Design a protein around this ligand. Structure first.
Ligand SMILES: [Cl-]
Ligand SMILES: [Cl-]
Lengths: 130, 129, 119
């Protein structure tokens, strides 16, 4: 019976070493998942920056265009007034609003940072275990 | 008998710690899943804004083309009235702009499938302890 | 008495081992699916960059044509009268992020539990 107890003790100790190895892997997975998610966060911030920049450029361009056409139309009409013509000199002078939208990922970036933090609180305490 | 009770004690201690470690795993699965779902929403919003901006751009160029045509016609009519060899027909056109759109439908489907399978992987803590 | 307790201990150990290998099997599936999810996000980010940079190019090409049309129109008007801003398009470059993301995915896939060693 003494032998049998030595065997069970041998099994238990071998199993623990493997279980510690397994949980070490798990900690590596958590670390790498966290890193990956942090990289995705960065990419998302960079996307918003460029997308919002492009929206601002579009808005500013449209504003300038509207002024250009207004000035041009004013000039053309004044020329027409001088020429005594029945033809219309008041076309091409205006620009409709084009509905430029913007990206705000504030809520999403915040939740993503939050999950990253809580993920990093999931690490197994291996020293306690093994 | 003495050796047995120390062994049973080791086993119970190990089980407590193992169940605790798997609890950490389940939390990690939950937070990974939450993170991916949040990324999914961000991707959807990015697509909406990118496609809106492509529509705004097409809509702008469309109006611009009409404005340049009307302006060019007026200038040509003035040149015709003035009896001039100088060209009144320049600045009247816009070349095609080539606006493209984003379609993440396939990616969104695969991401959802991966999130659902992730959430099938929880450890049954009650079975274990 | 003593043998009876020893059988219960062996039984407890085997049952726990069975449950532990099943649990780590789940862990491996979680690793697989997290990896898949991240590769899918990666593809999405590449497609976003493509469409964003194309739209930036279109905007530049447009602005270029516009400056020329306005110069021509301005010349025409001035000639009739005689007879009588920089748009900063930025571009998205995720190359560093894509490289780090790929590194994390590869290393995550190096964390699989060896179920055979455990079992
Ligand atoms: Cl994970
Ligand atoms: Cl055990």
């Amino acid at each position: 019976l003494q032998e049998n107890q030595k065997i069970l003790a041998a099994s238990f100790n071998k199993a623990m070493t493997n279980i510690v190895d397994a949980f070490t892997g798990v900690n590596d997975a958590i670390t790498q998942t966290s890193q990956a998610l942090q990289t995705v966060a960065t990419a998302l911030n960079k996307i918003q920056d460029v997308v919002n920049q492009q929206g601002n450029s579009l808005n500013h361009l449209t504003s300038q265009l509207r002024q250009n056409f207004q000035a041009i139309s004013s000039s053309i009409q004044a020329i027409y007034d001088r020429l005594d013509t029945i033809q219309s000199g008041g076309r091409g002078g205006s620009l409709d609003q084009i509905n430029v939208t913007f990206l705000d990922l504030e809520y999403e970036m915040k939740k993503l940072e939050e999950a990253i933090k809580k993920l990093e609180e999931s690490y197994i305490d291996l020293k306690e275990l093994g």
